[PDB]
């Protein structure tokens, strides 16, 4: 139905379709796809996993009993020993750092397991396992409806304004609908995003830039936003691709040089973007949530497939406008339905848990995005 297509485009062109994965349905439920996994370095292969097990855990009492040519692993990374007794020259007591030092000082080497044909065919070895798993789930298409096209005495007003009124009002209906759609997405996004946390949450409590705390320049928030992006780069396998924040959170707060006010709107920036941050990511402004928060996350794709996201959107058309001539008041209604969800497998150990939940159930998906984080922010008022 071309009229639903036109109404869809005239409505969804106004929502943040670029901060969520977009999929589509044609079914009462949407079949959503996504990718989840347990990690974040080197190989995922079993032959290699066996070697890790068969070489050493690199315990503190054994780190220096190793000598040139030996292998060891730590936090799933295989390293070779360069010269004798690695770490025996490093004063650092924390093995993780002692290792970082050992790599820098060329006491150990990040070990590459690329190998010859001989290694594989001779040992009749295993093959790398998947770093990723493909998930699928279904979420019901939910809906909302408007009865906002007020006509009656208003019909006469609309006739007086008949130059534009027929379509004008439908465009207005779409505008308010888009507003509600976008807000729905944002609430889900706020909920699913993981809390960004450092030392017990953003340097031991949510960042606070209130009058009694740090009413600086907004620079400290920008510092934490940049760290949120780091977190995504560290834990995810892509890079943050978007950021959304309220005005008080960042869309205005960062306008002290940490935010660009849409200098141009056709290059690396969508039409609904507020602008973009000094650390990148198109910035979208929420404006509704009382939290004044910042969200950093990843929406991505494999070729044409937008399978990566915290939130997945899947509209169902066959965006319908209906007119009912009740009395002398032939009002206009607008009906919109779509599925909206997060990948349920991020809250499940296996399919016997994932299959008994709904990716659209934000009570369970709360804080379990893994492709996004949120910064709580306490602001002056």
């Amino acid at each position: 139905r071309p009229n639903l297509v036109a109404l869809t485009r005239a409505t969804t062109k106004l929502i943040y379709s670029d901060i969520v994965a977009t999929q589509r349905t044609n079914q009462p439920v949407a079949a959503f796809y996504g990718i989840k996994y347990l990690n974040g370095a080197t190989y995922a292969g079993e032959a290699g996993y066996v070697d890790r097990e068969q070489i050493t855990e690199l315990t503190e009492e054994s780190k220096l009993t190793l000598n040139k040519g030996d292998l060891f692993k730590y936090n799933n990374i295989v390293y070779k020993v360069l010269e004798d007794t690695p770490f025996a020259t490093i004063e650092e007591s924390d093995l993780e750092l002692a290792l970082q030092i050992a790599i820098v000082l060329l006491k150990v080497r990040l070990f590459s397991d690329a190998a010859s044909t001989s290694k594989f065919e001779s040992s009749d070895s295993e093959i790398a396992d998947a770093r990723f798993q493909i998930n699928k789930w279904q979420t019901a298409v939910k809906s909302r409806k408007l009865k906002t096209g007020i006509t009656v005495e208003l019909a006469q007003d609309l006739e007086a304004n008949g130059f534009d009124a027929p379509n004008f009002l439908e465009d207005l209906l779409a505008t308010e609908m888009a507003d509600e759609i976008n807000k729905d997405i944002l609430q889900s996004l706020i909920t699913v995003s993981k809390r960004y946390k450092v030392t017990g949450i953003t340097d031991s409590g949510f960042i606070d830039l209130s009058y009694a705390s740090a009413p600086e320049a907004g620079r400290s928030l920008y510092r934490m936003v940049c760290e949120m992006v780091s977190h995504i780069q560290k834990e995810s396998t892509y890079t943050a691709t978007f950021c959304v924040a309220s005005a008080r959170a960042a869309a205005i707060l960062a306008a002290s040089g940490w935010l660009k006010h849409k200098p141009e709107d056709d290059k690396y920036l969508s039409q609904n973007a507020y602008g973009f941050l000094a650390n990148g990511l198109p910035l979208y402004c929420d404006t509704n949530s009382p939290l004044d928060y910042v969200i950093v996350g990843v929406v991505e794709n494999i070729g044409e497939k937008e399978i990566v996201g915290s939130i997945f959107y899947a509209p169902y058309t066959e965006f319908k406008v209906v007119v009912d001539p009740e009395s002398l008041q032939p009002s206009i209604g607008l009906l919109v339905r779509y599925a909206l969800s997060a990948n349920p497998y991020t809250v499940a150990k296996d399919e016997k848990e994932a299959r008994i939940i709904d990716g659209g159930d934000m009570d369970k998906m709360a804080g379990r995005s893994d492709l996004s984080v949120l910064l709580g922010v306490k602001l002056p008022k």
Binding site: Q27, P28, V29, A31, Q138, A140
Partner: protein, 367 residues
Amino acid sequence: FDICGVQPMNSPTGQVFALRAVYKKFPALAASTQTTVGDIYTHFFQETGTVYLQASVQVTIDAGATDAAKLDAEIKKQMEAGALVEIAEGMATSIAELQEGFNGSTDNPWNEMGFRIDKQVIEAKSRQLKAAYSIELAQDLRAVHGMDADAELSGILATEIMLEINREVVDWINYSAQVGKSGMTLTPGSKAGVFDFQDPIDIRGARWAGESFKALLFQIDKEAVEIARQTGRGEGNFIIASRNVVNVLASVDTGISYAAQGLATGFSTDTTKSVFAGVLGGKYRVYIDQYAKQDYFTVGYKGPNEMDAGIYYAPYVALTPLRGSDPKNFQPVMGFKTRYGIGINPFAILNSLGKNAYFRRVYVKGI
């Protein structure tokens, strides 16, 4: 296979539509009152509560019967006389029409058609089977005997899958079917759920199998009615039953169904182990459950519309081949898979046990 809606999936989840249905103070009879013919009165008997009584005779009910015991006696005498006729819901029904008719007004309460019409979300649940055969068999089956080798195994395998799924559909029918020969379909002296051919009550005093078998048919009709009543769509159209039951039914009305006469006449030409045997009395299409565990029958309804089945099978993928080998000895791997998903009217799939109005399942003993 042919007793369910299909509305085949073109995606798991996925869903199947069903026409689920939407889901009077008579004056007391008393001493000294002369009744009016056609009028209906309420009368409470000291024993067995109330009935409604309709006058056929304009009779004064013993004006001296101020004693409820005497009043009951006179009324019973008038009932014996045919003066007062006894019906309960049947009269409540008539008076409800009387009242509503007289109290009618057009207003604007257009009544809805009594249908809800809804759909279940259905996952295209899958099942499969493999051939597990050797090279040597394939070589010899063709080279020596002129067989099509693995092609024949493929035929058999695919058939077994097809039948295994039909079997599972039946298990779900039996699971969800309501207990038959229960409630509305019981003989007062019955055993509540099992038709036992050694029980004179179930067979209504039948003389041998000729009559006893017909008595089973009569229980089958009762089930068909209860189904009709509860679904609001009409009498059950088909029977799923055990070998003993179908053998019994087959003997009734001469030529209702296959007793494998095609196969025998043809001297083992085609076993056709995928079809309904025929139609009982010209009324119920009947299938022989080759996997029946004990002895039983289930009566069910199916309309012309897939959504008027009450049960659904929605093949998505069917008898789709797989090919491979095990290089250690390279014995071939061949097999087939199916995805279909299964549905049942919700009656508000694991939670449908004993609730399905479109089906009634009765146990059978004594054959």
